[PDB]
Design an enzyme around this catalytic site. Structure first.
Site, PDB file in Angstrom:
ATOM      1  N   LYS E  50      40.452  50.932  61.503  1.00 50.39           N
ATOM      2  CA  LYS E  50      41.888  51.184  61.531  1.00 50.39           C
ATOM      3  C   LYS E  50      42.518  50.784  62.858  1.00 50.39           C
ATOM      4  CB  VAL E  55      43.231  48.187  58.976  1.00 50.42           C
ATOM      5  N   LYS E  62      39.602  53.167  51.560  1.00 49.71           N
ATOM      6  CA  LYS E  62      38.751  52.320  50.731  1.00 49.71           C
ATOM      7  C   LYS E  62      37.499  51.887  51.483  1.00 49.71           C
ATOM      8  N   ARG E 139      33.069  21.786  45.090  1.00 51.45           N
ATOM      9  CA  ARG E 139      33.467  21.271  46.387  1.00 51.45           C
ATOM     10  C   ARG E 139      33.260  19.761  46.435  1.00 51.45           C
ATOM     11  CB  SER E 170      39.657  20.995  55.418  1.00 50.75           C
ATOM     12  N   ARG E 173      40.963  17.633  59.857  1.00 50.70           N
ATOM     13  CA  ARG E 173      40.407  18.519  60.871  1.00 50.70           C
ATOM     14  C   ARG E 173      38.908  18.337  61.045  1.00 50.70           C
ATOM     15  N   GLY E 179      38.426  21.225  48.742  1.00 58.16           N
ATOM     16  CA  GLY E 179      38.518  21.454  47.314  1.00 58.16           C
ATOM     17  C   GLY E 179      39.361  20.408  46.617  1.00 58.16           C
ATOM     18  N   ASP E 182      44.829  15.920  49.822  1.00 58.85           N
ATOM     19  CA  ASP E 182      46.264  16.011  50.086  1.00 58.85           C
ATOM     20  C   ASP E 182      46.672  14.833  50.965  1.00 58.85           C
ATOM     21  N   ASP E 244      46.754  15.187  45.309  1.00 56.61           N
ATOM     22  CA  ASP E 244      48.204  15.294  45.406  1.00 56.61           C
ATOM     23  C   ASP E 244      48.680  14.381  46.522  1.00 56.61           C
TER      24      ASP E 244
END
Lengths: 92, 102, 94, 80, 323, 83, 96, 93, 105
Positions: E50, E55, E62, E139, E170, E173, E179, E182, E244
């Site tokens: 916390k 949080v 939980k 992947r 990515s 990078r 996945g 782009d 895309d």
DNA sequence: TCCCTAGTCTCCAGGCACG
DNA sequence: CGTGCCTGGAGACTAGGGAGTAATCCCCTTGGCGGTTAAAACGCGGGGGACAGCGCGTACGTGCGTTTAAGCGGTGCTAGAGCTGTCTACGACCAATTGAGCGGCCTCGGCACCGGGATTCTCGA
DNA sequence: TCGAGAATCCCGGTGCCGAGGCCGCTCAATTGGTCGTAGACAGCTCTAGCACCGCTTAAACGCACGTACGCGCTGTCCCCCGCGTTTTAACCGCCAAGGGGATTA
């Protein structure tokens, strides 16, 4: 005193006309007018809030009720003054 | 003060307490009292200015209920605002029908 | 003098004035008489009596103004009881 | 009591009509006027006594009259 | 060192996202899970976690319950919920979201068998997602992604030498996998104050060379579909991947590429540095920020280094743009 | 999609005659139609201004019937049954 | 040839317009007028069909009351035809 | 949402009054509007009286006064008789 | 035991209690106030419904029509004073024909 | 669900209303 | 001219409100088109209401003599209006708890409607 | 005062839809506790509503008296009611464009 606004009435009167006096009967009549307008606006706001199912009294409903009550040019000028007053209070 | 903070004249805290004790809503906006005080001051200002105009029409330096009633009848929007309200000792607006005239 | 000239002068004098024009003692007597029909041995504040008298004056003034307007609408110069009934029906009193 | 409805004099009714701006009034007007005056006064005094009894007070207050007049739809100023 | 807490919070976040339709809870749970996975320390008490920002009471309770009992009663009851499991399984396919999966579960469709049996009830995008459900979830290796990027670049250069295609994300990078692909594309004749068929020509060139296999949606600015690298006539076919391509103005291409290069932490840090430097940086361009916060005319954008120097920051390679 | 004007003539003379006969007038002059249109317009405008205000205070885009009832009470008409 | 009396079809249907409870106002013109009046207050505002029917009914009630008042006024002036001046007198007496 | 109205109470009362009489749904809504109007009117009158009486509770005495104020004529006189006797039942367990 | 049955009433008592509490009408609400309000509502509803049923018998229609309710409200004088500023939708007006308008020869 | 700002108590006090 | 409270500002605590918009496709919504048929507009007697003037008379203003009740100045005198201090019923509030009420879905005759035929007003002569 | 005719009513028969009627499912009135307190009630104090009396005086009351204006009479005229005729729009149905909503980025 019975919670009167006579001092405010005199202050505003001097603000508008600093060179004229008022009768005590006139002051009481003005006080009753102020009380009646307050009650009318409050009832309109409460009925609007219940009709809008809101659980708070807000400035939006105040403006809505005032626009309901006051006639055209008077409503425009009054709402303008209220908006300016709210602007000054919030900003300062 | 709060009335100083808003720059108005009517006691804004008094209006806040009146709204609180009026049992009108569960919660009351803080600027709502400011708006209500502003509207009341506006209305009182217009009423008093018409009253002063009518008083100087009667050349009297005291605000009289007769002048107040005459102003309330003389302003169209104000008359429609307070049409069903009576003013003590205010008399009536002088209005003589043309058919009554010779 | 000329019939009507005194009437119009009194009309203007009553419209300029703001007094009650009602005998306060008879008004108090009538109020007490009506109150005897509702609750015996009741007390009335004097300012309350003056306010009731003034309200009665206002109601009578409005009714009479409406009656005169009706008479002008009915092309008549004298106000008659038919005008009062027409106004009361139009005003929704009864 | 003592024909108190007759207390409203004919000259008084004429004075009220002149304040009402009436130019000529018939003779029958003076009685129906008294009748209507009683009707208004009765419908006001009933509510007034109702308010005062709900106040459980033995004197009629003016504020009660004002509240009743508002209940009768005639807003009156001059008493608070 | 909080892998289990992050895993149990991710599936809880899915319940708020796709089932409860509460992004206001899903995003918060996701931020808490990201912070928990970002803490390289063992979580022993909910109060200890916390201290970390994001949080609160529910998350701490939980985490304490998960640490004490090894699971969550609400999570156990919602995992066994057939409606919830069906909705989660349906939302895994592209084109089906909260309302779509809810309606499908309401109509009795709960598995991919029903999805195939109700192709008339699936749109073109939904049908493509059902057809390539397994293929989309795999992947893409850096070798396959580099090969497909090279093929796309060759197709773009054949379509137009003035066309500029940049593979951001990515892969830019330097990540070994992604996945999807782009691509940010530009044209000198396509500016902020300047053809609607420029992307159409590139799409036709890519589809003609059998690189793009299916098209989900195609507009004048962005096109999304599925493409797959071809096999060499003897090996197994490569899995379908989502590609895309978005067309950007010449004055906006550099800012778009810089924004799409990532990462999210790096983008946030650069935006914060710009804001503290009196500038605002967006996907389109970078503009000065006034004394009252009023943004001025956007500064001209021609390179990532120009944008970095605009916010008075040293230019960083995309490999160093993790955070 | 195109705004229109001059619908006050939409209240036909036959409609005014029917409404008056429902009110119970034996004979009506032709000038009554124009003034009747004026009075109807005035009353409808007075109601509709408060109706639109009540709608906008609720931040809605549709003139609701409960809003109309509230306006009718505000104007002291208070039609029953609707809403 | 068989023409009714000049004040007899008038006396007719008055009972028929009193016994019935229909709208007597065309709904399309009423909705057009309502939309026209609301556009001057606000453009692109919707009015519910129930709202339009209720507003039409309310206007019918106000007009019925005004017409009854005018009929009584014409009886007050010993006249038969209803005059716009009579309507003005009725409106003044109501206070509107 | 669940809309509340006095339809069932109105139907039961109507059966208690006229055993063999029907009613329209529109008529039921009109009756509901009348019931709501009387409820709001009596409540506002009682609240205004309590503010006038400066009391913080709404008493059965305020209800009797409100009925005496709003209700007209003989309907006023009988209803209070129906009220206090009914109130008697509330005080008779 | 229901409180309306404890009073012997037909209109709901606790519903009225909930409405009065929710109505923001007052700081506190007494017990007998709901009883009095329910009794008044029952009396008014009974008075209206009996007149409506008599009218429907006069109109020979088994169901109650809004015109029947309007005619009943116009028939009674105390109800008319009670509902003088109330309009009944599709209720029409009571038959009222002018004596001067009557044809004589 | 977390947050942040606004609506409550409360809590003295330099200062406005009062007789 | 003190002086007597008092809301105004500052903690202390707590509740609603928003924390993500662009890009593309689809269904519900809404606005226009068209026949048609009741309905509105038009048009033309004509006669019945509106209306203008004459006669008059009586009823209402009008001036005046008179009086009597209403103000109006005292005088006292107490019913009760209003304010105070307890305490106590008592309303408010909380937590189960069940059932009056509510939503959904038949259904079968009340009642609109149609059509004919008998009923009775109603203008005309 | 009849009489043809036309508007009205009544009666039979028809079909259709909604008042109610039922039945399963809930959250809102009931039970039964507590707990701070609104006002209930007793009690005390001042005050204003009576309550009355003598004086004054003017509003009023009753009465001649003219006249005008309400009204009833008359003719006279033109406006709108009734009846037929000719557009026409509204209205019900029947169509297609966009606003809002869906996922997804």
């Amino acid at each position: 005193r019975k919670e009167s606004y006579s001092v405010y009435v005199y202050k505003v009167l001097k603000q508008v006309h600093p060179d004229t006096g008022i009768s005590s009967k006139a002051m009481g009549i003005m006080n009753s007018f102020v009380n009646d307008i307050f009650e009318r606006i409050a009832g309109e706001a409460s009925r609007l809030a219940h009709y809008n199912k809101r659980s708070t009294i807000t400035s939006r409903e105040i403006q809505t009720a005032v626009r309901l009550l006051l006639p055209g040019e008077l409503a425009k000028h009054a709402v303008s003054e209220g908006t300016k007053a709210v602007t000054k209070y919030t900003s300062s | 003060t709060r009335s100083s903070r808003a720059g108005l004249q009517f006691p804004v805290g008094r209006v806040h307490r009146l709204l609180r004790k009026g049992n009108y809503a569960e919660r009351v906006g803080a600027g709502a009292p400011v708006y209500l005080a502003a509207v009341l001051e506006y209305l009182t200002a217009e009423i008093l200015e018409l009253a002063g105009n009518a008083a100087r029409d009667n050349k009297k330096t005291r605000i009289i209920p007769r002048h107040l009633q005459l102003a309330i009848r003389n302003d169209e929007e104000l008359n429609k605002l307070l049409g069903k309200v009576t003013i003590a000792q205010g008399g009536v607006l002088p209005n003589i029908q043309a058919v009554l005239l010779p | 003098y000329r019939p009507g000239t005194v009437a119009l002068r009194e009309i203007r004098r009553y419209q300029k004035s703001t007094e009650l024009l009602i005998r306060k003692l008879p008004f108090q007597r009538l109020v007490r008489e009506i109150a005897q029909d509702f609750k015996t041995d009741l007390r009335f504040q004097s300012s309350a009596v003056m306010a009731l008298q003034e309200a009665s004056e206002a109601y009578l003034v409005g009714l009479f103004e409406d009656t005169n307007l009706a008479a002008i609408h009915a092309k008549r110069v004298t106000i008659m009881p038919k005008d009062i009934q027409l106004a009361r029906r139009i005003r929704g009193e009864r | 009591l003592r024909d108190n409805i007759q207390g409203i004099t004919k000259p008084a009714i004429r004075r009220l009509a002149r304040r009402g701006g009436v130019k000529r009034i018939s003779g029958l007007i003076y009685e129906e006027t008294r009748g209507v005056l009683k009707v208004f006064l009765e419908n006001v005094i009933r509510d007034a006594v109702t308010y005062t009894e709900h106040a459980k007070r033995k004197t009629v207050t003016a504020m009660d009259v004002v509240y009743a007049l508002k209940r009768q739809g005639r807003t009156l100023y001059g008493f608070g | 060192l909080n892998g289990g807490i992050t895993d149990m919070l991710t599936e809880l976040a899915n319940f708020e996202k796709n089932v409860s339709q509460a992004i206001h809870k899903y995003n918060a749970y996701r931020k808490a899970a990201s912070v928990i996975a970002k803490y390289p320390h063992k979580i022993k008490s909910g109060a200890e976690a916390k201290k970390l920002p994001g949080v609160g009471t529910k998350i701490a309770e939980k985490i304490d319950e998960f640490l004490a009992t090894g699971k969550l009663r609400k999570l156990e009851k919602i995992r066994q919920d057939d409606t919830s499991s069906s909705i989660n399984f349906l939302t895994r396919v592209s084109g089906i979201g909260p309302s779509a999966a809810r309606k499908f579960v309401d109509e009795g469709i709960k598995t991919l068998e029903d999805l195939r049996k109700n192709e008339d009830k699936l749109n073109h995008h939904q049908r493509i997602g059902l057809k390539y459900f397994g293929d989309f979830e795999k992947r893409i290796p850096r070798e396959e992604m580099l090969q497909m990027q090279d093929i796309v670049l060759n197709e773009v250069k054949k379509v137009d030498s003035e066309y500029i295609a940049t593979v951001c994300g990515s892969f830019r990078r330097g990540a070994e996998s992604s996945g999807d692909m782009d691509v940010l594309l530009t044209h000198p004749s396509f500016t902020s104050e300047s053809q609607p068929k420029l992307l159409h020509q590139v799409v036709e060139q890519l589809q003609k060379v059998h690189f793009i296999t299916d098209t989900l949606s195609k507009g004048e600015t962005k096109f999304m579909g599925v493409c797959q690298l071809p096999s060499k006539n003897d090996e197994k076919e490569y899995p379908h991947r989502r590609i895309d391509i978005r067309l950007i103005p010449k004055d906006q291409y550099y800012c778009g590429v810089l924004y799409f290069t990532g990462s999210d932490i790096f983008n946030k840090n650069m935006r914060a540095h710009a804001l503290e430097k009196g500038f605002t940086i967006n996907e389109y361009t970078i503009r000065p920020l006034g004394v009252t916060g009023v943004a001025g005319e956007p500064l001209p954008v021609d390179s990532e280094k120009d944008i970095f120097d605009y916010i008075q920051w040293k230019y960083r390679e995309p490999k160093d743009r993790s955070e």
